[PDB]
Design an enzyme around this catalytic site. Structure first.
Site, short mmCIF file in Angstrom:
data_model
loop_
_atom_site.label_atom_id
_atom_site.label_comp_id
_atom_site.label_asym_id
_atom_site.label_seq_id
_atom_site.Cartn_x
_atom_site.Cartn_y
_atom_site.Cartn_z
N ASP A 1 79.64 26.04 -6.60
CA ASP A 1 80.10 27.41 -6.96
C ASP A 1 80.27 27.47 -8.44
O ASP A 1 81.25 26.75 -9.04
CB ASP A 1 81.29 27.89 -6.20
N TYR B 1 80.06 20.36 -18.63
CA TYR B 1 80.87 20.25 -19.95
C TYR B 1 80.84 19.13 -20.92
O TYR B 1 81.00 19.41 -21.93
CB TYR B 1 82.08 20.20 -19.40
CG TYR B 1 82.91 21.52 -18.86
CD1 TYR B 1 83.80 21.72 -17.66
CD2 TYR B 1 82.84 22.58 -19.64
CE1 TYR B 1 84.21 22.92 -17.31
CE2 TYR B 1 83.31 23.85 -19.35
CZ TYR B 1 84.13 24.05 -18.16
OH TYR B 1 84.80 25.09 -17.89
N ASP C 1 79.67 24.50 -16.39
CA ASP C 1 81.03 23.84 -15.63
C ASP C 1 81.12 22.51 -15.28
O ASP C 1 80.56 22.10 -16.27
CB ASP C 1 80.59 24.63 -14.02
CG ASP C 1 80.56 26.16 -14.16
OD1 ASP C 1 81.58 26.61 -13.92
OD2 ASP C 1 79.60 26.87 -14.33
N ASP D 1 81.18 30.58 -10.80
CA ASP D 1 81.47 31.89 -10.92
C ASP D 1 81.28 32.72 -12.06
O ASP D 1 81.67 33.92 -11.95
CB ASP D 1 83.03 32.02 -10.24
CG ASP D 1 84.05 31.23 -11.24
OD1 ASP D 1 83.91 29.89 -11.48
OD2 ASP D 1 84.78 31.98 -11.74
N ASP D 2 81.00 32.19 -13.04
CA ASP D 2 80.75 32.58 -14.41
C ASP D 2 79.64 32.28 -15.15
O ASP D 2 79.00 31.19 -14.93
CB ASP D 2 81.93 32.40 -15.45
CG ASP D 2 81.79 30.89 -15.33
OD1 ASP D 2 81.51 29.89 -14.63
OD2 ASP D 2 82.39 30.34 -16.74
N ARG E 1 88.94 32.94 -5.98
CA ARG E 1 90.09 31.97 -5.92
C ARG E 1 91.50 32.81 -5.92
O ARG E 1 92.46 32.27 -5.70
CB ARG E 1 90.16 30.97 -6.74
CG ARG E 1 88.79 30.49 -7.44
CD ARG E 1 87.70 29.95 -6.40
NE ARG E 1 86.69 30.01 -7.08
CZ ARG E 1 85.38 29.28 -6.51
NH1 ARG E 1 85.49 28.76 -5.58
NH2 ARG E 1 84.22 29.78 -7.40
MN LIG Z 1 82.84 28.32 -13.87
#
Ligand SMILES: [Mn+2]
EC number: 3.1.13.1
Length: 636
Positions: A203, A309, A197, A205-206, A496
């Site tokens: 957060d 990232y 991320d 989410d993955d 979201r």
């Molecule tokens: Mn993510």
């Protein structure tokens, strides 16, 4: 009499009228834009009956040469619910509507119950109540809400939210206990999963993983947070998310679809926290395709690395900074890299390869000042999570197609069947082999799309794209013409996206054993309002950022996005700002200059000098803070 009356009525109905839109400027007389070239002149006294943007029927008054239009019927009024800055003395208030082309101030008066003493400069929401064309004496509006005061630096966030009647808070969230249905939630814990991320997200989410398989094969596990394990249909929080539909994201400020106590913790997939996750197994190879090798199944994991990232993309080349501490996470990064760079090859050869215009980011101080406006890079790690996401959203579309024929799918039809032959004609000019027959069929759509890539510039692509429709949301499955997908289903971000949350509940039914009619109706609408909001705040902030640059020699590369009759619109490459360049700034001899909205070109002395898509240098001529307009000139 009766007799005389009846005659007069018929003489009245048969008299010459036209229907059009009022186009006023800083002059007194305006025009009724009927169509292509039909524009009537509306004289000053008649201008006072109507408003710029009104759609009206007008009586056509006959004269020797130049005809006149007299406003008679209001078809469609420009203002209804609107925002503006209040003025006047105590008992005689007016509101100037916040629109470039509506200078005149409208008498107003606070509603029933509204108690705020409307100062001067106050931003207010208003509703139009009286219109001269409805037989009213004059224009009258009702102040229905106080937004904020005049010098407020936070004007851009509040006004935008108020004009689109968007929430400014997260939902109130009594977080009740977690639920049970038949959760045969498995165990993928021990095997070290990783998040990829941005730097400041609380957060994630993955999550992601891959396995050392035997012969030429890979194994991606996409692991997405479980919001629906706590929220239930009907639940308060279920019913609030339905209304909001999407998290509204603005420059430095978002309005969550769901309470933070889920987002930041309970659903977030942190570092070394055991978390109930919904996962997806798959296998790929040298071309990269998965068959009946995909199971969707509730599970639970303990993520073992929070990964950024840029740090990640740094290592996937070589740099000087970051190293993955583990041999677990390190090898697991090489896994996901080979996965990504191989998965792009399937969508170039069986779909449509993406070139998603570079998201610009505003960098603001704690007081709201714009410090900078950088453009978000798309390095490898981004393309890693992109790839995975893309592939993993795909798997759902098939599954939910087979079981139900229900889903939240995104349906892009491509070209409007109306413009169908309008298009095969166009390319015929440019000399491009496009049979009007095949065209519509996906095979045609995507085969045309290839040929465009082969072009020197993206001009022709810009042309044809005035011909297609917009991506929609449906309950039935469809094809994603724009993506090159047979069917497309989002579950990537249930936190979201209500669609993705509804998908989750449908995805639970799969493992086990129809979203109502108007749901998609207001899902589309909220996504539109959300997009306008984001754009409008950005317009304010661009005007503020660029103000000090006006009149200077600072140059900016700008791509030409649209050609109008009076000039052309450019977007500054480095920051994304949109500026206008009026035609008398493009060439000193007006009769020598042609701007065609219809051809996406500007001709000077018969030749083409600019076209939509070109990248030229510009200086900033003017920035109008009141209206947030930016005027630019080409470098000479
Ligand atoms: Mn993510």
């Amino acid at each position: 009499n009766p007799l005389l009356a009846q005659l007069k009525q018929q003489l009245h109905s048969q008299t010459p009228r036209a229907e059009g839109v009022v186009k006023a400027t800083e002059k007194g007389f305006g025009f009724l834009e009927v169509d292509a070239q039909k524009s009537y002149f509306i004289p000053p006294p008649q201008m006072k009956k109507v408003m710029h943007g009104d759609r009206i029927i007008a009586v056509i008054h006959s004269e020797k040469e130049r005809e006149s239009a007299e406003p008679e019927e209001l078809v469609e009024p420009f203002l209804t619910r609107f925002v503006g800055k209040v003025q006047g003395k105590n008992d005689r208030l007016a509101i100037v509507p916040d629109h470039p082309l509506l200078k005149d101030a409208i008498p107003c008066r606070a509603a029933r119950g509204l108690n705020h003493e409307f100062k001067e400069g106050d931003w207010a929401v208003a509703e139009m109540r009286r219109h001269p064309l409805k037989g009213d004496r004059s224009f009258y509006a009702e102040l229905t809400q106080y937004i904020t005061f005049g010098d407020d630096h936070f004007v851009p966030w509040w006004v935008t939210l108020a004009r689109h009647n968007l929430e400014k808070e997260a939902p109130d969230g009594v977080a009740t206990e977690m639920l049970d249905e038949g959760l045969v939630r498995e165990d993928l814990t021990a095997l070290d999963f990783v998040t990829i991320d941005s730097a400041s997200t609380e957060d994630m989410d993955d999550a992601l993983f891959a396995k050392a398989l035997p012969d030429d094969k890979l194994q991606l596990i996409v692991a997405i947070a479980d919001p629906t394990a706590w929220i239930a249909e009907g639940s308060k929080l279920d019913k609030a998310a339905k209304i909001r539909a999407f998290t509204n994201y603005l420059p430095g400020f978002n309005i969550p679809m769901l309470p933070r106590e889920l987002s930041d913790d309970l659903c977030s997939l942190r570092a070394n926290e055991v978390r109930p996750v919904l996962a997806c197994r798959m296998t790929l190879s040298a071309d990269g395709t998965i068959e009946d090798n995909i199971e969707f199944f509730a599970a639970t994991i303990e993520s073992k690395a929070k990964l950024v990232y840029d740090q990640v993309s740094d290592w996937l080349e070589n740099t000087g900074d970051w190293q993955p501490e583990s041999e677990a996470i390190a090898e697991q990064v090489r896994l996901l890299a080979q996965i990504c760079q191989r998965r792009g090859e399937w969508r170039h050869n069986h779909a449509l390869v993406f070139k998603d215009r570079p998201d610009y980011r505003f960098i603001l101080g704690e007081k709201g000042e714009v410090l900078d406006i950088v453009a978000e890079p798309r390095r490898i790690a981004n393309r890693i999570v992109e790839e995975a996401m893309i592939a993993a959203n795909i798997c759902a579309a098939r599954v939910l197609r087979d079981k139900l024929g229900f889903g939240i799918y995104n349906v892009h039809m491509g070209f409007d069947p109306a413009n169908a032959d309008a298009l095969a004609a166009l390319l015929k000019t440019h000399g491009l082999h496009v049979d009007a027959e095949e065209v519509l069929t996906l095979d045609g759509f995507c085969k045309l799309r290839r040929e465009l890539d082969a072009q020197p510039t993206g001009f022709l692509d810009s042309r044809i794209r005035r011909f297609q429709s917009f991506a929609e949301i449906s309950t039935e499955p469809g094809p994603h013409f724009g993506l090159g997908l047979e069917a497309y289903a989002t579950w990537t971000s249930p936190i979201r996206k209500y669609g993705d949350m509804i998908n989750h509940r449908l995805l639970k039914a799969v493992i086990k054993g129809r979203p109502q009619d108007e749901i998609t109706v207001q899902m589309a609408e909220r996504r539109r309002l959300n997009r306008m909001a984001e754009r409008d705040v950005g317009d304010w902030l661009y005007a503020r950022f660029l103000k000090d640059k006006a009149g200077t020699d600072t140059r900016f590369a700008a791509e030409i996005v649209d050609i109008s009759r009076g000039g052309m619109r450019v977007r500054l490459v480095d920051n994304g700002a949109i500026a206008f360049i009026p035609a008398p700034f493009l060439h000193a001899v007006r009769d020598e200059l042609v701007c065609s909205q219809e051809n996406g070109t500007v001709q000077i002395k018969g030749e083409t000098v600019y076209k939509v898509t070109d990248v030229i240098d510009v200086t900033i001529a003017e920035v109008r803070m009141e209206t947030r307009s930016i005027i630019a000139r080409p470098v000479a």
